[PDB]
Amino acid sequence: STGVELYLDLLKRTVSNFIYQDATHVAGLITQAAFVEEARESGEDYPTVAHTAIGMKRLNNLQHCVESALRDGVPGDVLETGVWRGGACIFARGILKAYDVRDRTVWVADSFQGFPKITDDDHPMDAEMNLHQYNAAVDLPTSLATVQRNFSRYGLLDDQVRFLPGWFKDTMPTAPFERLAVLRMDGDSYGATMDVLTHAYPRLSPGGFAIIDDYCIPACREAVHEYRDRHGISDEIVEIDRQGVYWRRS
Amino acid sequence: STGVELYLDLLKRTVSNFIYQDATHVAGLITQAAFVEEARESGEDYPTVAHTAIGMKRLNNLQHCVESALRDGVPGDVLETGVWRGGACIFARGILKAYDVRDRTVWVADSFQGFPKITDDDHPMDAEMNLHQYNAAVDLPTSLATVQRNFSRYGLLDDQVRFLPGWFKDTMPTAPFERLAVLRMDGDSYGATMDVLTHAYPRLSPGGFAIIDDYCIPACREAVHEYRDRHGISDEIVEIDRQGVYWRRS
Numbered sequence: 275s276t277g278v279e280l281y282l283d284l285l286k287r288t289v290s291n292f293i294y295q296d297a298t299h300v301a302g303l304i305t306q307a308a309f310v311e312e313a314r315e316s317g318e319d320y321p322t323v324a325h326t327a328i329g330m331k332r333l334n335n336l337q338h339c340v341e342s343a344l345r346d347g348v349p350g351d352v353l354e355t356g357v358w359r360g361g362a363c364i365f366a367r368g369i370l371k372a373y374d375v376r377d378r379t380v381w382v383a384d385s386f387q388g389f390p391k392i393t394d395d396d397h398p399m400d401a402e403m404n405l406h407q408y409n410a411a412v413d414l415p416t417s418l419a420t421v422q423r424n425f426s427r428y429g430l431l432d433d434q435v436r437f438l439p440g441w442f443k444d445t446m447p448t449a450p451f452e453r454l455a456v457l458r459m460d461g462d463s464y465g466a467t468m469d470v471l472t473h474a475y476p477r478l479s480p481g482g483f484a485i486i487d488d489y490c491i492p493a494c495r496e497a498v499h500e501y502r503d504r505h506g507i508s509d510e511i512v513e514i515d516r517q518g519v520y521w522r523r524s
Numbered sequence: 525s526t527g528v529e530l531y532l533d534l535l536k537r538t539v540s541n542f543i544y545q546d547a548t549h550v551a552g553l554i555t556q557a558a559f560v561e562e563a564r565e566s567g568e569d570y571p572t573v574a575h576t577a578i579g580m581k582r583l584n585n586l587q588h589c590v591e592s593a594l595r596d597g598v599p600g601d602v603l604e605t606g607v608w609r610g611g612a613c614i615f616a617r618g619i620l621k622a623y624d625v626r627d628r629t630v631w632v633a634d635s636f637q638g639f640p641k642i643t644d645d646d647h648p649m650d651a652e653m654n655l656h657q658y659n660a661a662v663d664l665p666t667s668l669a670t671v672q673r674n675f676s677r678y679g680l681l682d683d684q685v686r687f688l689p690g691w692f693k694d695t696m697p698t699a700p701f702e703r704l705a706v707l708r709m710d711g712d713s714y715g716a717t718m719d720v721l722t723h724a725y726p727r728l729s730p731g732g733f734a735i736i737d738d739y740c741i742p743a744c745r746e747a748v749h750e751y752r753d754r755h756g757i758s759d760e761i762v763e764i765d766r767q768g769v770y771w772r773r774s
């Protein structure tokens with residue numbers, strides 16, 4: 275175990291709070307508050323304190339994607355769309371820091387207000403799901419200032435972390451990045467997924483990775499397949515855990 | 525910058541819980557529960573959750589002592605007497621892990637049940653202080669099993685961590701280590717300090733470090749000076765923060 279391996283291993287345990295094992299909110303299928311190791315390992319609970327909810331398997335996937343991009347010389351930045359308390363983005367910045375990468379940026383995109391209120395412009399599956407109803411229940415609204423504060427606690431708030439506050443339909447089309455090596459999508463809805471695929475995926479480098487955190491949600495999956503069909507994308511969809519999948523852009 | 529530096533920096537922030545900033549118990553001179561950065565930085569509060577109470581300055585000192593011993597080839601193990609939830613010993617094991625040191629052990633010595641009830645054999649200053657009164661108030665009693673669990677959460681429970689459960693007057697004289705490079709004393713009382721100086725200090729290598737966590741406590745200081753006078757020890761006492769001091773054995 276090298277210094278780098280030890281740091282990144284600890285960083286994953288810390289952002290997911292395997293260290294102190296905070297209770298989960300009781301919501302959805304989670305019926306008790308107790309920390310359950312298997313649930314945190316696969317990112318299935320709603321941490322009361324942890325900086326990410328994606329779990330160890332999806333953190334490991336993020337590491338694999340970033341390391342592979344670095345190893346293979348895939349150009350570009352890392353973007354996460356849907357960051358909550360920022361833990362996955364903190365981890366991404368940590369990976370770059372561990373390898374002393376100074377020429378890539380972690381872009382942190384969120385409304386910083388939780389899920390949007392549904393209107394008649396929403397896809398019917400998003401309207402039915404109405405994720406907005408869960409904002410308070412899982413402490414989803416997390417301000418930009420809080421996310422910045424969280425980065426600073428790890429010593430990782432610096433000029434290689436850039437923030438894109440706003441709804442993805444507004445921020446993605448003109449987001450100032452030129453190229454992405456990893457595009458990590460974690461907005462849950464058809465709308466958020468389609469917004470980001472439409473406006474950010476064209477900037478994903480060949481050899482880069484597209485991660486769909488919420489593929490288990492029918493609305494999200496619907497967007498993925500509609501987008502891939504439209505663009506003739508046949509790159510293998512690889513399952514990570516019970517929620518997430520990814521593909522590598524050929 | 526380097527992987528090692530990043531890992532050890534993160535490990536300090538984690539064991540002291542600068543990451544999630546848990547409340548303090550309201551006790552002693554601490555009059556409110558809120559996390560205060562300055563108090564955790566100098567190890568002056570009573571963390572509700574964090575694995576160590578010693579704070580960042582004393583964690584930095586422990587790192588300095590261990591790194592200096594390794595750098596200078598000072599032979600021996602690391603012993604902490606008075607470990608609470610184990611965070612300072614977890615950090616010590618992490619330092620050895622970071623440098624891939626396989627030939628030194630971290631010894632973890634505690635009653636694993638908090639301060640002892642005062643008896644007629646106790647030093648009058650210890651009787652007056654009666655540290656036993658605080659056990660439950662600051663959650664001091666922490667079992668061996670809990671401490672082992674805590675090490676495991678960092679991936680640092682292995683055969684280079686050895687436990688010495690019991691009162692120091694019982695465990696120290698025949699503790700199986702031969703040599704120490706760092707002796708970290710954090711038992712607060714005249715009795716605990718004198719027990720450990722008497723029975724462990726003779727095994728501290730020349731060039732090794734003796735850390736007195738609780739030098740601000742009159743009873744502890746009394747023991748330190750009595751011991752040093754008895755043995756003709758004049759090695760400079762160097763202040764770390766508002767509580768701790770150390771010297772290097774010449």
Ligand SMILES: CC[C@H]1OC(=O)/C=C/[C@H](C)[C@@H](O[C@@H]2O[C@H](C)C[C@H](N(C)C)[C@H]2O)[C@@H](C)C[C@@H](C)C(=O)/C=C/C=C/[C@@H]1CO[C@@H]1O[C@H](C)[C@@H](O)[C@@H](O)[C@H]1O
Binds near residue numbers: 405460487488517
């Ligand atoms: C609490 C927040 C959460 O809400 C739930 O989990 C709600 C679960 C419903 C209650 C389920 O319905 C029940 O199924 C029973 C089996 C039979 C029930 N009935 C018929 C008796 C029926 O009522 C769902 C199956 C409904 C479908 C539409 C669905 O998938 C909805 C997804 C909702 C996801 C939100 C956001 O969480 C995101 O999750 C991502 C995965 C994470 O990565 C992360 O990003 C996170 O932020």
Ligand SMILES: CC[C@H]1OC(=O)/C=C/[C@H](C)[C@@H](O[C@@H]2O[C@H](C)C[C@H](N(C)C)[C@H]2O)[C@@H](C)C[C@@H](C)C(=O)/C=C/C=C/[C@@H]1CO[C@@H]1O[C@H](C)[C@@H](O)[C@@H](O)[C@H]1O
Binds near residue numbers: 553710737740742
């Ligand atoms: C809560 C637990 C704690 O209790 C206290 O802190 C009690 C503080 C008293 C209230 C103080 O009195 C006040 O002084 C004011 C200056 C004027 C006040 N008054 C007359 C106006 C007077 O009332 C003390 C100074 C009294 C002296 C005998 C002393 O030092 C006692 C030490 C007690 C330490 C325990 C164990 O905590 C350990 O501390 C280590 C240092 C840590 O590293 C760590 O190991 C930890 O576990």
Ligand SMILES: Nc1ncnc2c1ncn2[C@@H]1O[C@H](CSCC[C@H](N)C(=O)O)[C@@H](O)[C@H]1O
Binds near residue numbers: 354356363414462465
């Ligand atoms: N259309 C939209 N535009 C911008 N942000 C959105 C959005 N829909 C959802 N979000 C945001 O998407 C996030 C979903 S949760 C993200 C989890 C996070 N990746 C983690 O590591 O735990 C929330 O922060 C929410 O505010």
Ligand SMILES: Nc1ncnc2c1ncn2[C@@H]1O[C@H](CSCC[C@H](N)C(=O)O)[C@@H](O)[C@H]1O
Binds near residue numbers: 577710
């Ligand atoms: N005589 C004695 N023998 C063994 N353990 C003792 C003792 N007197 C006090 N202790 C133990 O000394 C510890 C004091 S607190 C130690 C704090 C710890 N170093 C940290 O990193 O935060 C407690 O765990 C208590 O159980």
Ligand SMILES: [Mg+2]
Binds near residue numbers: 460461462487488
């Ligand atoms: Mg998700």
Ligand SMILES: [Mg+2]
Binds near residue numbers: 738
């Ligand atoms: Mg102390």
